[PDB]
Design a protein around this nucleic acid. Structure first.
Ligand SMILES: [Cl-]
Ligand SMILES: [Cl-]
Ligand SMILES: [Mn+2]
Ligand SMILES: [Mn+2]
Ligand SMILES: [Mn+2]
Ligand SMILES: [Mn+2]
Ligand SMILES: [Mn+2]
Lengths: 95, 98, 82, 107, 95, 107, 87, 98
DNA sequence: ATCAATATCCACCTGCAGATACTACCAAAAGTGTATTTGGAAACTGCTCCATCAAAAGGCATGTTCAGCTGATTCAGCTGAACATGCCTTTTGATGGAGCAGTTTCCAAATACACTTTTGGTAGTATCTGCAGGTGGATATTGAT
DNA sequence: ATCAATATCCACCTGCAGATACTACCAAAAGTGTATTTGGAAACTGCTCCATCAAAAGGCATGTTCAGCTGAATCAGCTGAACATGCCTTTTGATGGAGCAGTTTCCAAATACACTTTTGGTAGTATCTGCAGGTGGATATTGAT
C-alpha cells in the first residue's frame, strides 16, 4: 500500500510527443524504467567521482556535462549535451 | 514418404527461434534447479514469482549469447558443428575462467 | 522414475537456446557441457541474490535481490525493477 | 503561482524528483540548481530517442503497442544505443535475426 | 609541498610482521598503496549500495561484512570475515 | 592515556584514517563505530596475505627486496588473489612463464 | 616564438621488432606478416580511447597538463585498472 | 656457419621476455605517438612524464594479453601462426567489437 | 526438367487479457525567508615540463636463404539430424498460511562541539647496502652428420 | 652418438641508486568526552502472494537410418624465421627558461536549512480494444524423380 514511484508517467508523456498513436505494454514500460534508472546511476556516479577527484563538495551541471561526455557515444553525447544546455538556459531565462 | 535433408530443419528452427522471444527452457524444471542450488546457501527459502523469472530471462540470454560466441569459435576452426572446446575457448577469452 | 534436476534442462531445450544463438549443428557432448556452464552461472548469481536476502533478514528471495546480483556480476537485466 | 521546475525548463521529466534522488543517493554533499535540470533533460532526450526507434519498429511489424521485442530491435540495430547498452539484457527482447554466411545451404 | 598521505607506514609494519628480514621497493610500495585504495573503494561502494537498497542511512560493520562476502572469493572472504569480526568484538570489549 | 582505536582493536592499519575516508567518500549519511574497525582489519588481512606470498617469491629469486614482479608472481600464482585482481594491471609486473604445449619442439 | 614541430605518422614508431617482442611475452611463436599493421590499428584505437577520457578529466579540472591521475582514472573507467601510478 | 632451425630462437625469445618486466616499445617513439593523438583531441597539452609511462604500461599490458588470446584463437584453428583473423576473433569475443 | 508434400503468407474474426482512463487523497515538491558554504578573482610561488643538444650504443632496416606450415585435396568412417508416438512431465488453475511490509515505539547509538594530544609525512642529511650489470669460466642445448 | 658452435648458467665484484633511518618538527588529524538528535530493532497484524496440490494437456524420450561432416594423410608452394650487414635514433645527461599547477584571502554569489502551502503522482479501480491466434485457401520451398 505504500507509494512505489517510477518514471512511467513521464516515459508515457514522451511517447505521445514522439508517436501520438502508439501505446506501450507493461513489460516494455518496466524496461524503460530500468533504462532511466540505469543511466541516472551511471551519470550521477561519474559526476560524483568527478567532484571527488577535484575536491569539490558540489555536483553542478558541469559535472553532469562531463559525465555525459565520458559515458555516451559520440552523437548521443552531442545531442544530450545540447539538450541539457538548452534546458538549463530555458530554466534560467524564466522569471 | 517425405524427408528433409540434414541442416534444412536446423536452419528453419534458427529462423523461427530468432524471430521469437519466448523462454525456451520449461518453467518447472528450471524452478526446481534454482531451488536446489539456493538450498546449499540457505535452507527454507521462498522465491517471489518474478525472482525466478528474472533468473530465467538472465540465464537464457547468457546462454544464447555464449552459443553465438561458441558458434564463431567453431566457424573459426572451419567447422559448422559446435563442440565443448568451442564453448571452452569462448569462456576463456570472455574472462569467465582460465 | 527419479532423475537429477540439472537433467531437467533437456537436450531439446538446450538445442532451442543454441538455435536462437544461430547454431546449425551440435555435438552430442554439448548438452552436458552446457549443463555445467548453466549451473556455474546459477550458482554465482543465486549466491549473491541470497546474500542480499540474508542481509535484509528475509526468507524470500526477491526480484530485486536477483536484479542486484545480476548487476554486480556484469549481467544487468532490465524489466524486473531497479 | 507555484510553477514546476520541469515546466520552467520545458521538460516532461521531473526536475524536482531528480534533484531529490541526487540528494539522497550520497553522490555529493551539495547539488547545484542546474544539475537536476540538465540531468532530467538528458534522461528525457535518451528516452525520446529509444521510443522514437521502438515506435518505428512497432510500426514495421504492423503494431501500435510497443513491446520489449521492439525495444530490443531498436537498440541493437542502432550502433550508438547498442554500445551504450552493450552490457544490458532486455527481458523478452530476443535477438536480431542473424545467420552466419557459411551455414547457408548452397544447392 | 602539501601533505600527501598513504598506507606506506602500515604496509611496512605488516611486511615486518610476516617477513622480518624482507624490504620493499618504492614501486612495489606504490603497487600496495593502489591495492589498498582499490579494495577500500570496492568494499565501501558495495556497502553504500547495500545500505541504499535497504533504505538505511548508516554503514555499519554488518554492511562491511556483507560487502566483503560479495567481493572476495571463498577462502579470502572466510578469513577476512574472521579478522573483521574479531577486530570489532575486541574493539567493543576493549573500551 | 590517549589510546588509538587501532591499538584498541588490535590492528596495525589506521582506524581513524579509515573512518575519515569513509566519511569524506559520500558512501552514506552515517558511519557506525564498528565499520572502520572491520574495514581496516580486512584491508590489513589482505595486505598480509599478499606480502607473505610476495616475500616468498622474493626469497625464491634470491632477493631481499620485494619488487613489482614478486607481487605479480604472488597474485597470479594464487587462485583467489588472481580472481580478486583479475581486471587489474600491476605496472612492471610482467607475466607468468607459460608456453602452450603444442608450440614446443618435436613429437 | 618557436611553435611545435608537426607530429605525423608516429604510429610507425611501433616497429615490427617491438610488436614481435610484445607477441613473445604473450607466448606467440609464429607471426603472419599482416599482424604488424593490424596491431598498430588496435593499439591506436586503445590509445585514442584512453587519451580521450584522460584529456576529458584534464579539461574538466581546467588544466593544460595531463597528469598520471587523469590516465589512472581514464584506465579505471575503461575497465583497465592500473596499479603503481597513484590513486 | 651454424643455424638454429625456425622456431628455436622464437621459443628462446618467449622464455626471455616472459621472464623480464621491462617495457618492449622504445620510449621516445611511444611518447611521440601519445602526443600526436592527444594533440588531435586538444592542442597545447602538456604531459607529466609519469602520465606517459602509465599509458605505456597500460598499452603494453593490453597488447600482451591480447596476443595471449590471439595465440589461443590460432591454436584453436590448428595453426601455430597468429593472423589478423585471430586478433579479430579475440576482440569480438572480448566485447571490444562484439 | 515433373510433381508432390509440406512449409509459409495473407486476409479475415473476435474474446479478453491487458491496456488506457478516471478519481481522490497525500507525500513531497515548491514558495519564503534565514543561515551556512564555496569556489573562482586576484596575486604570488617553485616545480616540472619543454626544448636543446652532444655522444655513442644499441636496436632497427634491409636482403638473402630455405625450413617447414599453411591450406588444398581427397576420402572413409562416424555422428548427429531427421523423424514417428504414447507416457510423462509440464502446465493450468484455486486453497491455505508464511512471511512481507506497514507503523509506532523508544533507547543505544550516532552527529556536533570544541578542546588536547599525537602522529605521520617532511625537508633536511647521513648514511648503508642490495643488487645491476659485467667477467670468467664451467655446463647445457641444439643441430649436423 | 659425437662433436662443435653457441647459448646458458652461476657465482664473484664493484660502485651506486635507492632504500633505510634519524631527526627534529610541526600542521593536521585524531581522539576526549559533553551536549544533542534520531536512526532503526523490535514487536505487533493482515493481507499478499507463495507453496502445494490435484486435474488437463501437450513435449519429449526413444531407436533406426543414412547424409554429409570431421579429421586424417599427403603434398607444394610460399611464408616467415634466421642471420649478416650497415648505420640511424634513442637513450642519457645535462643547460636554461617559463608555463602553470598549487596555495592562500575576500567573500558575492550559491546552497542548505526550517517552516508552510499546494498540488502532481500514486494507487485503487472502471472501462475499452489491440492483437493472439484461430480459420481458409493460395503460393513457394524443398526434395525426390
Ligand atoms: Cl548547477
Ligand atoms: Cl558498526
Ligand atoms: Mn613470517
Ligand atoms: Mn500469397
Ligand atoms: Mn643491407
Ligand atoms: Mn591555477
Ligand atoms: Mn496475426
Amino acid at each position: 500500500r505504500s507509494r512505489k514511484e517510477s518514471y512511467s508517467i513521464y516515459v508515457y508523456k514522451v511517447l505521445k510527443q514522439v508517436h501520438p498513436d502508439t501505446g506501450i505494454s507493461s513489460k516494455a514500460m518496466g524496461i524503460m524504467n530500468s533504462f532511466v534508472n540505469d543511466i541516472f546511476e551511471r551519470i550521477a556516479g561519474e559526476a560524483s567521482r568527478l567532484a571527488h577527484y577535484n575536491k569539490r563538495s558540489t555536483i553542478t551541471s558541469r559535472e553532469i556535462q562531463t559525465a555525459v561526455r565520458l559515458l555516451l557515444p559520440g552523437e548521443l553525447a552531442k545531442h544530450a549535451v545540447s539538450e541539457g544546455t538548452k534546458a538549463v538556459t530555458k530554466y534560467t531565462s524564466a522569471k | 514418404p517425405h524427408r528433409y535433408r540434414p541442416g534444412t530443419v536446423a536452419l528453419r528452427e534458427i529462423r523461427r527461434y530468432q524471430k521469437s522471444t519466448e523462454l525456451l527452457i520449461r518453467k518447472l524444471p528450471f524452478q526446481r534447479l534454482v531451488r536446489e542450488i539456493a538450498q546449499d546457501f540457505k535452507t527454507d527459502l521462498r522465491f517471489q514469482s518474478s525472482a525466478v523469472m528474472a533468473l530465467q530471462e538472465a540465464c537464457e540470454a547468457y546462454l544464447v549469447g555464449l552459443f553465438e560466441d561458441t558458434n564463431l569459435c567453431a566457424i573459426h576452426a572451419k567447422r559448422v558443428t559446435i563442440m565443448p572446446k568451442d564453448i571452452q575457448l569462448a569462456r576463456r577469452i570472455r574472462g569467465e575462467r582460465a | 522414475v527419479l532423475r537429477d534436476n540439472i537433467q531437467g534442462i533437456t537436450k531439446p531445450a538446450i538445442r532451442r537456446l543454441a538455435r536462437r544463438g544461430g547454431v546449425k549443428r551440435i555435438s552430442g557432448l554439448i548438452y552436458e557441457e552446457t549443463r555445467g556452464v548453466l549451473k556455474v552461472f546459477l550458482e554465482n548469481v543465486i549466491r549473491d541474490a541470497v546474500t542480499y536476502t540474508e542481509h535484509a533478514k528475509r526468507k524470500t528471495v526477491t526480484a530485486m535481490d536477483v536484479v542486484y546480483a545480476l548487476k554486480r556480476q556484469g549481467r544487468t537485466l532490465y524489466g524486473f525493477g531497479g | 503561482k507555484a510553477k514546476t521546475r520541469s515546466s520552467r525548463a520545458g521538460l516532461q521529466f521531473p526536475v524536482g524528483r531528480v534533484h531529490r534522488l541526487l540528494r539522497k543517493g550520497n553522490y555529493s554533499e551539495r547539488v547545484g540548481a542546474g544539475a537536476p535540470v540538465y540531468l532530467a533533460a538528458v534522461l528525457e532526450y535518451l528516452t525520446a530517442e529509444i521510443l522514437e526507434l521502438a515506435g518505428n519498429a512497432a510500426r514495421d511489424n504492423k503494431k501500435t503497442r510497443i513491446i520489449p521485442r521492439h525495444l530490443q530491435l531498436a537498440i541493437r540495430n542502432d550502433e550508438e544505443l547498442n554500445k551504450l547498452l552493450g552490457r544490458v539484457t532486455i527481458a523478452q527482447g530476443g535477438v536480431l535475426p542473424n545467420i552466419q554466411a557459411v551455414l547457408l545451404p548452397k544447392k
